Every structure is written in C-alpha cells, then in structure tokens.
# Entry
Amino acid sequence: RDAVICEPVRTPIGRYGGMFRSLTAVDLGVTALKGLLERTGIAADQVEDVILGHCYPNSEAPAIGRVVALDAGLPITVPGMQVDRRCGSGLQAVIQACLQVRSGDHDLVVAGGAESMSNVAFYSTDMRWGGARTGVQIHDGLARGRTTAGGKFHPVPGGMLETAENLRREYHISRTEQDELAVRSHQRAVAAQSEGVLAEEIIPVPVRTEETISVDEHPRADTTVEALAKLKPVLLKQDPEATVTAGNSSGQNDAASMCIVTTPEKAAELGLKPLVRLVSWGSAGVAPDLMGIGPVPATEVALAKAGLTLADIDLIELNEAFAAQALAVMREWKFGEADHERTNVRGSGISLGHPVGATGGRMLATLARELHRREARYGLETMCIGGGQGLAAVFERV
Amino acid sequence: RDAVICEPVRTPIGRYGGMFRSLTAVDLGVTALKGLLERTGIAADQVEDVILGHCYPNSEAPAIGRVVALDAGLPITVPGMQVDRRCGSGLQAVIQACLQVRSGDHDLVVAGGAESMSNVAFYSTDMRWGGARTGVQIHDGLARGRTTAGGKFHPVPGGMLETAENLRREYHISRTEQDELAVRSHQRAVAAQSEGVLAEEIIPVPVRETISVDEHPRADTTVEALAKLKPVLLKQDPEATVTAGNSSGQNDAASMCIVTTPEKAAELGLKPLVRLVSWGSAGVAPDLMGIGPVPATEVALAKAGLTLADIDLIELNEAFAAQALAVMREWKFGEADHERTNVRGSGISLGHPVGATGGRMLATLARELHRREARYGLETMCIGGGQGLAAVFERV
Amino acid sequence: RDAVICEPVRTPIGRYGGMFRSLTAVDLGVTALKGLLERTGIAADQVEDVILGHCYPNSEAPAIGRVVALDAGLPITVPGMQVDRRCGSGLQAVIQACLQVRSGDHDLVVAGGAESMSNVAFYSTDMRWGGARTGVQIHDGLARGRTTAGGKFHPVPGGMLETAENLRREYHISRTEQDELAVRSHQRAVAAQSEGVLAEEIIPVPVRETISVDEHPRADTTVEALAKLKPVLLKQDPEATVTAGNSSGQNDAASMCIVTTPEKAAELGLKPLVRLVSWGSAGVAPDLMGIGPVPATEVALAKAGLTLADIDLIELNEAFAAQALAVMREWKFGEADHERTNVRGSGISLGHPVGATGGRMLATLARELHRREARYGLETMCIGGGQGLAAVFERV
Amino acid sequence: RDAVICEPVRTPIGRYGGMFRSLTAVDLGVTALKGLLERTGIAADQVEDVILGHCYPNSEAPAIGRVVALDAGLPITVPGMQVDRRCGSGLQAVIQACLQVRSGDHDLVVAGGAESMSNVAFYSTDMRWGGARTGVQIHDGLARGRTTAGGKFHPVPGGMLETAENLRREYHISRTEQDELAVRSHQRAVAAQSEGVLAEEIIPVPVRTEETISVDEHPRADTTVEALAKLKPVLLKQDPEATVTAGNSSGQNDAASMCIVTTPEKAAELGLKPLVRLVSWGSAGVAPDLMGIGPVPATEVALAKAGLTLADIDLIELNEAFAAQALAVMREWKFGEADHERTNVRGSGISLGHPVGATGGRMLATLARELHRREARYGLETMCIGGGQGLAAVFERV
# Structure
C-alpha cells in the first residue's frame, strides 16, 4: 500500500538570535503541529505517532515528538519520538513514517522536525563528578558539534565549512559562481513571497510583544554579487584561496516543519488531499571531510530503487548547505543552465536558512506543493549531512 | 521478506559512577559493535546502517550510530543515526531496522543502543543570551529529563519514581511484594551468571582490566535485607514503598545485533535466532507511564493475532518493582507466569542503561527462546513520558 | 608625619548594563590610574603601593591593585592589593594608604577603588567535587551577596533595601521626603555638570568614543514623577516607600588618588588638597545597617576633637533616601545643613559602584573644600552587613 | 606605641578535598576565633576590628572578617573586613592591624586568615549578558588566579608552577636538592607533632562524621628522597628538565589563623602575655614569572628599615610554595646547611600545607612561639606572592 504526504507545512524561518529567539523548539513544533491539524480538520485521535527530526535534543524535551504532541493538546494516547541523522533528520523522520504506514502498522502518523538553534544548550561533562582535578569545560552545543560528527578518526577542525572549501578546491569552484548561486537563492525566495505561494506552506507564528509573524526572516530582495564580493571568507587566515562566506552559506536558524503521512484510503476517508507519495529513498556514507557530496551517492541509490534517472526528475530540492558544496553536487550531476530552472525554485538554505531538524520538512513542503502546482510528476529531495552522509527521497505527484 | 535477528549481544552493565565510569557511550558502543563483527565474521562493508537508541545525546557524539560506526573502524560508506523514544529506544532501533530490511531497502543493518549514564551532561539554556533577568539554571540531564518528558501540562516533580508510587497506590502493591520481585530478579541474574549462559550475550570490555560480568546483581539479596531500605519519597508520602533496592538503577552499557534476511543470513553463515512478528506502541498518562506495556502489548498481540497465553517467554523491563507488578496484575499473572518472565533477570538486578535496555532484553529473549525450543517471545517496556512499546518475536 | 591627598579623580559612573558594560573593573581602574599619573606627571616607579577597594573580586583579577598597576604600565616593582569592607572599601583603601605613609614606611602610594557591577561573576560551589546528588547551582554574585553579609545569625532576606525599609519604619520617614531628597540629589549632580566643576574629578573613558559624563543623573527628575514608582518590597509591605528612584543604583567606575607626605608632594609639584585628620569604624545591627555612619562619625569626630557643627562639608553616600534621612534625623539636621551635604550629588543620582564610591566621595569633598575655602570635611557611609566608616579631612 | 602579638593560633590544616572539605572558610575562621577568645578570655567588646587575609573571596561571605565575627557570636558592634595580597594576605592583615594599633586609632584588634581551598568557587564572567558570540568559559578560582595575577603584559600560562621551574632553571636547582628540602620539611613537622609543641598553636576543630580534629592532615613520617624521586614533574611534557612535583610543592589546603594585635600598654591592662613586637616590614614587586624570589627584596627592605642584617636574625619562617622556589631564595641569602637549623623549624608549606589566606598567621604562630622557646631575639617571616610580589616582617621577642 502507498504512503502519501498530506498538508506539508512549516513555521516561517527565524535567524539565530532573531525574531524567534524567545521561542523553544517545542514552541515552534507545537505551532506547526497545531497549524497542520487546523488546516486538515482531522480528529486528534487519528494520529498514531509523532516522529520528529531534531538535532540538538536535551532534557528540556526528551523524545521531542511526544512532548510536542502533548503540548499541542493531542491525547495522551499519542506516542512520539526523536530522530537524528543531522541535516537529513526531517527526511529521515518522513521516511520512517512512510515505512511504518506502508507496512500496515499505522494508518496515519505525523512526521516533522523542529530546531531552535537560538536556544541550543551549553553543556558540560565535568560537573557530575567534579572538576577538582580536571577543571570544568563548557561547550556550545552548536560549536562543539562541528568538530565531532566524524568521530575521532576523521577530524575536520573547521567542521562543515571546512569540507565546503575542500569541495571548492577539488572542483575548482569560483567565488563568483558561489555568490551567483547565493543571489538566485534570495531572488527565488523573495519572488515566492510576493507571488503568494509561501502562504500555503507557512503556519504563522504568534510571538509576544500579539504580533503574528508569517514571513521568513532571512531572505533579502537586494542581494547582489557585488555586495557579496565584499564579504570575508571565514577561513581566509588559514586559506588564501578560501571562498566560503556567511553570504554564500546557509546560516543557523529556528523553525519547525510538520506533515501527515498516511495511506490513500485513510486520506480519502478523512477528506485529506494527498500531494505526493514516496517512490524511493536512499542513504549513503562518504568521507567526513567531503560530506557535502553526500547527495550524489544517496540520490543514485534512490533513483536506482525507483528505476529512474535524474532526467526523469521534474523538480529538485537540494539543501544548499554551502554554495560551493551545492555546486559540487551539480557538477557531479552534469547540470546545465536549464537544470537550475527546476532546482530549488522557491529558495534554499542559503536564502531561507538551515534550521537543521526542520530543513527536511521545509524542502518537502516546497517540493510537494510545487509538483502539484506545476502538474509535474517526480521530485527529488536530497541533502548532505554533517559527519559525512547523504539522504535522498523520490516523490511522485498523486 | 522476513527480518531476522542474529547474534544479539551487549556489553556488561556498569553501575552509575561504577566500573565503566571512565568510558563514554561511544566507547561502549564501539566495543559492542566490534565484538559483534568479530563473532559473526561479517565484512564491515556489509553493514548498510547503524541505528542506535540513545536517550541522552549531546554534541560529543552527534547522530551516534554514525560515530560508533566510524570509531569502530567501519568504512566511511556506512551510514548511521540516533533515535530516542526514552526507555523504548533500543527496541525502537530494532523495529526500524526490521522495517527497512523487510521493505527491501536494506539487506543487513545494525540495530542497537548505547548509554553512559555516568557521563550524561549537565546543561543550561540560560547562558547564550544571558541570565541577567532570569538568573541561570544548570540541569542534571538525568534528573531534569525525569520531570519534563510529559511536557508542560503533565509535569512529574518526582520523576519516574513518582509514577511508580502512583501505580503502587492505585494497585495496592505492598512493599513486600516489591522486594520479593527484586529478590527474584537478583536470583535469576546470578543463576544466569553461574549457569554460563551470559557468555553468549556479553562482549567483554577493557578498561584502563577486561570486564565481562555485570556490576549490579548480588547473590546475597534477601527480602529481610531489602526491608531495611528507606523509600526515596518517604518525606512526601508516609506509605511510600519504592527504594533503591526495588527500583532499576542508572547504568552504562551498549547493545548490538544484526538485522537481516534469512537468505542473507545463510550466505553469511549467520544463525538467525528470531524473526519479528509484530509490534505495538501506545501512549498513556505521563504520571502513569509504568502501565505503558499493557496497551502496547495488546496492540502487538492483536496484530500477531495472538493472546498472552500464546507467549512462551516474556521480557518486561522492570523499571520499578511496583510498576512491573502493576503490569502483571493487568495480565492477571500467577506464580507460574513469573517462571516465563524475565528468566535471566531484569532492570532491577541488571540495571537500566536506558538506550541499551531494549537490546539487552532482545539478546536474552532471542537466546532463551532457542535454548528452550519455545516459539513466541514478547519484549515490552514502559517509557518515561507515558508510552509503551512491545514486540512479538518467533523462534527461527 | 602628615598624609595628604593629591589629585583625587574618578571615571564617569556607568549604569549596570549601561555605557561601560563591556569594560572590566580592571579596564576602569587602568583608565583612572593612567589619568591620575598623566595629570600629576609623577614617574611610575615613585608609586610604592596600589591599594584598591574592590567588593566583587574574582580570579580574573586577583589582588586587583597589582593587576591594575601592571596593566596601567607601572613597573614590576610596584606592589598592589585588594581590600573589602563592602561600601566603605574605597575609604578603607585611603585610610590604609594614610597609615603606611604617616608611619614612615612609604612616601607615596595610590589609593582607590574599582567596581564593574556589570561584570560581577556567576559562580558555583557545586562543580568541584561533583553535582549528582546535590545538583548544581550557579549564583549571581550580586543577587547572592544581598543575603549573606550579616552571616547566619542575622539574616536579612531583602538585603540592604530591607534595612532601608526598616529605617523608614523606625523613623517614620515619608515616601515624599525620600523623593524630595532624590530630586535634590539629581539637581546637584546636573548643576555640577553644567558648572564644569566635574570635569576636574573625571578621567574620560574611551569605549570602542570618549565618555566623560555620568550616565545616571537626569535634569528632569520631579517629585511628581518619582511618586509613580512602585516600592520594590510593596508586595511584602503595603507601607513600603523605597523605590528605584530614591535608591542608589548598581554601577561601574574606578577612583584613584595620591597619598603622600607634604614634602614628597612639594618635591614633585603635587598640590595637596587635604590631610586625614581622623577616622572611625563601627558595627551596627545588620538589619539597621544604614545607621552605620552615626556611631562611625562620632568615633571620628571624637578622635579629631571636633563636633559635627565644626564640619564645613559632609559627603554621605545615600544608598537609599530612607537610610540617608534616618542618619540626618539622628544628626538633627535642619534645612541649612542640607546645603553643606552632598553638594555635587550622591549615590542616588550618580550611582553606587561599590568599591569606587569611597573614592568618588573623596574627589568631591577634597575639591569642594577648596572651592568653598572651608576647613573640615566629613566622608561617611553605611556598609553592607551592618558597619559604618567615617573620616574627617582638613583643607591644606 | 609598639604593636605586639598575643596568642597566635590556627586550626589544624586539612588537605584539599580532605578532612575539612565540608567546612567553609567562615567555619574554620569562626572556630579559630572562638578558640583565641576562649584561651585568652578577652572580652568580645574589646575587639575593635577583625581583619582577615582571604584570597578566594565570594558572595558566600562578603567582607569575611565581619561575617566571621558575627558567626562566632561576637557583638554586632565589632567591625571587620577582607584583604587580599595573595599568599601574603595573612601577614598583610597583621601588618595592617599593627599600623592601626600603633597609630592610636585602635588599642586592640584581631588579625588573621581563612581559606577553604576545597570550596573555592568555579565562576564565569560570560553568563550575565550571554556568550552567544564569545562562547562561555567556567574558571577554576584556583587555577585561573595563577595565570592572571601578573596581568595582561605578564601572562604566565603555566601558573605558579611555571615560575618555579623558571627559578629551578635560573638557579640550577637539582631535583634531588628539591626533594631533600621536602623530606626535611616533613621530618620537622612530624617531629613538631611528636614533641607536643603544635598543641599550643592549634585550635581543635569539631566536625560531623562528631569528631574533634587537632592534627594537621598533610605531614607524613614516611617521606623519603627515594620515594619522592618516583613522582613525575607536572610540567614534564613541556620541559624535559622539569623538576617540580606535587611532592616538592606546597599543597592546596584548608585552615584558618587568628591572633590579637595590641599595644604593650593595652596587653598589660588586660593581663595578656604578648609574645613578639613588630620591628619592621617591607613589601616589594618582582617579575610575575619569577614571583618566587619576592622574599629577597621584601626582606632587604624590612632589614634595612630595622637597621639589621640577616646575620641578626635568630629564626626564619619562609613559606616554601615550592622547594625550587625556597632554594632559590636561600641561594640569594647565601644560606649554608647550618642556616637550615634556624629556618622553618616546625615545617613549611610543603609539609604542613598552604591554605593561602591563613598561611601568614600559621608562620607567625610558629615564629612567635619558637622565638620564646629558644629565647632568641629576632625572627623573620617572609613569603613569595603570586603575581610577583614579596612581603616580609621582622618580629622581636618581648
């Protein structure tokens, strides 16, 4: 039986330290979840699991999908959980949801993701037993995670950005091209805002001052290659040829994404309108210091399973973790000017942001809704993953 | 296709602050994973995913299954990830493994769990934008999580231990009943040790000395001795019964198994022990979490078209004696059922290294089914925050 | 022999969280000390000791006098130290400097104070020997010191402010009288600004922009406006009167001066402004701390063979209007006396940067005693935890 | 007027994390102070000031002398305060008490020191306004203080220990020499114990599992050059010629010290028995990275003021922060092995411990009492100070 995606929504995406700074990841998740349930009008006891991608969990919200469900006023009979495959966590959550619905185990579950990078904890492993002899180290959850996802045998001191430079280096990718991709990104997000399509994607978020925010914080209409040319590469001191700036990289962000994963039968029965179904997915491991190229093997797996080629794909969502990383993938994919027209049509991580746990759900909402709008057939959602992985899923319009 | 479980193993279980205090959750997981690969002799590049339950993750090891893969020396081509459904995380990892093997997506994956509760972080969310007006709090990862899992509308100030006092109160469970279960638990664990059946489950672990025995079980445990302990919530509640002796502890361990198909198992010369029949999950009141196994088991049994009468062996994690006794009252157990339940010990005697508990129960359930030539096995646990998880397995 | 005070200076006084927030107590101390040496033209190796009152010290700057000396570029041969007698600390530093000059041990030393209440540390006594059992608490140094200065036998939960309410209650001091004094204090501060007399006390501070103006005094304070403010402790006490308007605040600053002999001074071109006649210290009940200046002053007047009527100028740090008015009650002040007291403002308008307050009061008293060609000045202050300190100086 | 010292006493000295770990600096101070007043019988309202050296103050006890007075039950009329000149703080408190008694301001005050190094705080200056852009550090009050004391232009990343190797290197001091000094220190402390002389100095401390402790925790009778040779130099990694070990270094410790400072005329009126009068004191600054040599110029100043030379000094207390550091000073003094007979005759920081704020009064209680038992005339007390200072005082038997 099929697994279909219904009403994929998200909150707007705030900047790190920005408009959502005072909201927890649970706050955003509850908003998105309540928005989803209001739009679909389904009974709350129809939900059989809430599975959330979530990359900086802590005991403020253990097994966060459960906490989100309770805090949104779902029955205590609704189970939930947390998954982490770094940047792929929100797609991981969806795939998991698809497997347990296709299997006959559940008829309807929620898949999503929530991240408040503004409020990632500082933590220490030296206070339980005392620093009387070692001292006490405190770690930024965000900063520390950049150096550890490849474990002790594959060190990347400069984390993901360092690997983005590695790709720049290996693929001989110019700064200009990187900032050019950056500009397109902002233009498509800003275009999509004005063309009124983001309205169906977004659950507005009430913050309190009772101001309801319904626009993404990071996109800018005045973005240009000349302005971006002025930006300093983050690793310039250690690398003369460094190209990666804050301007052609995705930032740190706050957001939540939610959707319904069900069977076509159950959806008809509840008056849902399925937008896509899962055709295939793939995962893959690559070298931690080249994590950015993770989408290429992942996508090959997903395409092979489905019996498709990349030419069979009408729409592409590729999280653009860094411009150099994304361009590397598109080089491997042998992309023309023509291919950019079907890729990241409403923006990407660079323009919208990268609220890690929620990104898979953002890309999905965009992909699902745009396939429908273009009456296109196949979509590919794929992303690189810190520590050296890739995830890809192929969807087909219903 | 069928998904079968092969070579379900685990490290010994260390006490909180005890023998494994110097080892991280990754250290423990790496040792279990390497011991698994060494026993099965399978090439590392056969592993298509490492899915681990891990309830107190932090940035020392993001997406821990991937880190454990790489730190165990597995190729960069092996993916991995982390899952948290509290106490059910280990079973959850196994279930997901079965779903992606049964679906035809993967042929062979590793499912397991890792927890170093000795090294769970202290943390704050008041230090980034400053604690000028709010003040600053630093939370014990363990302690804080006990109160927040039911969310803001179902806080439990006394954590999971409060929920056990609730079930004891509701079910009229005497202190003596609880301590008898506890004594039974230690008896079985120690008996299992002396019998030598543990050598099959356990991956020995080297510390800076090579350990291969569980830290917590005690041969000398008596009802009279346990009567001497003071209930943790005595001040709050004069008829409190839950002590450190009839509770499961905080612990360190890692658990690993192969999830694969009969066809792939046979090519690799593996010995499939059980296959997954069905599973069920459920939500209950956070303050009554401990009852979680009752509706989750119903679901798993319903799906399998079985009844509890059809179940030859049961693994129930006994987070607390009072919690477990409440489950078994709903199951209407007699003396005799006790004989097919947790026959090599439980959380009370072996400890509860949360993320790794599910794989502990599976290693015993899978192996004990084969050892007894029995047919059906049930694995179930309560879950902090008010959930339950259950899985039915069938001997291959 | 004689001890005379030369060139008493200070930085502007920043609000807590305000204009100097990014500057450390050492940043403020170094600026003030460099300003002092610049104005005086003294050679750096002529400084024999740097003694600083400093009430929230921490290991970023141990024995802060020495750190400030070295960071201001004095040679490694210049000793330095830290003193703490709460609010009296800066006066305590001056008195110590006088003692070891008058004794003949030293010919020239620097006395001062430095406080960055913006950067007072958060600290914990639970992280050394382990937090699992107790939990880990981290305290605001400022919030914490509110309840501890009187020890365990004389608790004052509401801190110094509670003692201000105590004095309000004992002396039947009206809310309106308090606010009148607060307006008075702001008027004199701005007056002193506009008249350019302050430019002489102040070493301007460069921030990443040079600042030379105190942050808290407001030209527009009215009894009408202050009446709107709510008593901090009104919830506990309906008759509470002490607000943020008629209290001294939390602030950042440093003060410095030269303490030398008349001969060394003449020899170096220094212009001695005053000499220390006498000083006194006293302890009072922690819960009536604010009355501290009354016994302290009597001690000091007594050792000087003077009476209060003999004093030409008073500096009284008004930590709170209610406290200040209580002292003035006991001093049987009349409207005329208010004219010779705190003529350039006080804690309420300028702020109360604890360790640097004594040096502020001294810079005003010394220089206003020359402006007015007067003879004796009194500097006195209540102290955290139930103390009082006072010093009589005489114009040279 | 002279300043004379009566009844200098001290608590036993606990080890870092040892027998006094559940006691605060105030607890130790209250005990020593109650002990002083109970021995002497001095009426409490005769005390005009309680001045305590204290190097790791925090808001648990602001102006610690005042707190200790109150907590010891003294009348609310007794003022008090805290001073910090690091290692010199206990002597500094005594010197200040002498100045303000010699001047006529006071007739009688308490001077002492208190330190619970077991209980020194960890702290941060990054948490009030947030560490979003700076990150967060938590510092050991103890380890941090050792690297910051010389300010920004004289950083010492290796702390006190580094300065000790510096002295070892510049004075060509052998490990064996250092360990020999350490052995002797323990011998003399251990002998002082068995000879019964320490009971005069010591105020026994009640502690609850209740026991009464009256013996110093760190001195050990089994200290041998052979045993010491076995320990590895703390800075060996950095410096293959490193010689300084925990065995030839003073420990971190908890204790408190108290004495009466008064005039001959006041002591007579109350029937007190003064032990010594303050002849002179000196203070000096040296390079922070050579802080350990501080006593040499400090002592020169005190001797010059006194019209004395080192030849006139019958007894010497020198706090040996490190054997290397102490030997360097003795090398400057041109000390023979014969001078060891008059120097630290009941032990030193290496054996007895070094509870910083209370060390000054520890040395004074020994010096004053030993000067009378030997009916010698002059005694010197000097100490090197972290951050590059020295403090010295000459006392005369009364």
